[PDB]
From a paper:
UspC from Mtb is a 441-amino acid protein that has been previously identified in bioinformatics analyses as a putative active importer of carbohydrates across the inner-membrane of the Mtb cell wall. The uspC gene forms part of a putative three-gene operon, uspABC, of which uspA and uspB encode the membrane-spanning subunits of the transporter, while uspC is a homologue of ABC transporter-linked solute-binding proteins. The fold of UspCNt follows the architecture of periplasmic binding proteins for bacterial ABC transporters, consisting of two subdomains or lobes that enclose the putative carbohydrate-binding cleft in the centre of the molecule. In conclusion, our data strongly indicate that Mtb-UspC is a carbohydrate-binding unit of the essential UspABC transporter system, with a substrate preference for sugars containing an amino group at the C2 or C3 position.
UspCNt crystallized in two different crystal lattices. The tetragonal crystal form (space group P41) contained one copy of UspCNt in the crystallographic asymmetric unit (ASU), whereas the monoclinic crystal form (space group P21) contained two copies. An initial model of UspC was generated using ARP/wARP, extended manually (COOT) and used to determine a molecular replacement solution for the monoclinic crystal form (PHASER). An improved experimental density map could be generated by multi-crystal averaging (DMMULTI), which allowed to build and refine (REFMAC5, PHENIX.REFINE) a complete structural model. The conformational flexibility of UspCNt revealed by the comparison of the monoclinic to the tetragonal crystal form highlights the potential for structural plasticity between the two domains, which may be functionally significant in ligand binding and is comparable to previously reported carbohydrate-binding domains of ABC transporters, which undergo an opening/closing motion upon ligand binding, exemplified by the structures of GacH. Comparison of molecule B of the monoclinic crystal form of UspCNt with the tetragonal structure demonstrates that UspC possesses the capacity to undergo a similar closing motion.
Author numbering: 39 to 438
Write the structure that this text describes.
């Protein structure tokens, strides 16, 4: 009996092959085969295959797309215990009171890389960075911390008279037109939404609050790089962090590999700052769904059970590049990194409260491209956040 597993990441396909070889040794009635399809056309192809009965037994879904499949009965109900799976990914795949996929991988949450040498030089202990709060009111603690951490070529900090924003040598932070690392967390941390019911919905009080704050950090405080540096250069801030030029660099686990490889100074990871509604990180996960039209539904059930076990899911995290969604399997990931001198807890701890889903779905790419020029102007400090969001929303939706 052959069960086929469909997915889109190659290194993970390698890890699956190692996982399923271990499965078949304890369950030799079943051979599992992986089937790579490139990310760029995965969903358009899965849509055709599912629709006409030739999709694989097991396939990867994201949050963006599973809904259409779940409603039309394409997907098996995941009828197991869920206490050992990331709650974030579990919620991501629950619809009408049913779990529709076995959680496989998670992004985890956003955190704050810091350059400890640059903290030491400014008189800041790394623990201080874990208790920061952003706000439009006078309960804010982020801004003065970023100000202390932003230095011009004369040694004048951002809050000092004389400070020259043209001559900044060291930025405190990476506030920028950068959804995943920055503004999606600000919106959620303000109680706003970015997307609702497959439509862009960021024209709302919370998002207004978030964008005013960010606009201010960049154009008025000068504690993050100018928007011309970062609008359409997604890597600018990370490169400045690597060059020893940025105190705090707010990002996800995707920057762990690029940071560990090249960073020559002492560094760590601290918590996401809290907003008016707490520390709310963007997150996103991947689940493996069972095909309801599978020729061998029992064997699929055995394979899904293994994929969701400590032992099976451990394989995806053993290389420290993808994070297991099984909670008991995640120490393979922590260990990978602790041995390389990095504590990864803040990326995980942040999930322990409320969250915002990574936006996605049909017509999203096109919508995201359409809002882009308006967001660029907004981060350039031009016009008004209010008027910009209203026009950007109408434009994003039209394109969708």
């Amino acid at each position: 009996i052959v069960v086929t597993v469909r997915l889109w990441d190659e290194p993970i396909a390698a890890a699956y092959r190692q996982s399923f070889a271990a499965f078949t040794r304890s369950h030799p009635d079943i051979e599992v085969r992986t089937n790579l399809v490139a990310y760029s056309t995965y969903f358009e192809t899965l849509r055709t295959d599912v629709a006409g009965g030739s999709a694989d037994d097991i396939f990867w879904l994201s949050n963006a797309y599973f809904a259409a499949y779940a409603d039309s009965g394409r997907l098996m109900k995941i009828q197991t215990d869920a206490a050992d799976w990331e709650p974030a990914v579990v919620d991501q795949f629950t619809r009408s009171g049913v779990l529709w996929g076995v959680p496989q991988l998670t992004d985890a949450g956003i955190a704050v890389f810091y350059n400890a040498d640059l903290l030491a030089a400014a008189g800041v202990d790394p623990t201080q960075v874990d208790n920061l709060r952003w706000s439009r009111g006078d309960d804010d603690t982020l801004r003065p911390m970023l100000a202390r951490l932003t230095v011009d070529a004369d040694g004048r900090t951002a809050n000092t008279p004389g400070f020259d924003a043209r001559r900044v040598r060291q930025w405190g932070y990476n506030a920028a037109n950068d959804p995943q690392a920055i503004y999606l967390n600000y919106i959620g941390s303000a109680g706003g939404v970015f997307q609702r019911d497959g439509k862009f919905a960021f024209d709302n009080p919370g998002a207004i609050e978030a964008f005013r704050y960010l606009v201010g950090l960049i154009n008025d405080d000068h504690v993050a790089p100018p928007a011309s540096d970062t609008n359409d250069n997604g890597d600018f801030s990370r490169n400045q962090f690597l060059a020893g030029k940025m105190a705090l660099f707010q990002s996800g686990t995707y920057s762990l590999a690029p940071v560990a490889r090249d960073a020559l100074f002492h560094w760590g990871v601290a918590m996401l700052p809290a907003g008016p509604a707490g520390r709310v990180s963007v997150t996103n996960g991947i689940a493996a769904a069972g095909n309801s039209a599978s020729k061998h539904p029992d064997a699929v059930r055995q394979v899904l059970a293994w994929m969701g076990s400590t032992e099976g899911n451990s394989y995806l995290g053993r290389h420290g590049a993808a994070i297991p969604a099984v909670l008991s399997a995640q120490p393979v990931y922590f260990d990978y990194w602790s041995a390389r001198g990095v504590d990864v807890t803040p990326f995980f701890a942040v999930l322990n409260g409320p969250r915002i889903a990574a936006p996605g779905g049909a017509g999203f790419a096109a919508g995201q491209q359409a809002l882009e020029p308006y967001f660029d102007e907004m981060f350039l400090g031009r016009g008004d956040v209010t008027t910009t969001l209203r026009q950007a929303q109408a434009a994003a939706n039209a394109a969708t």
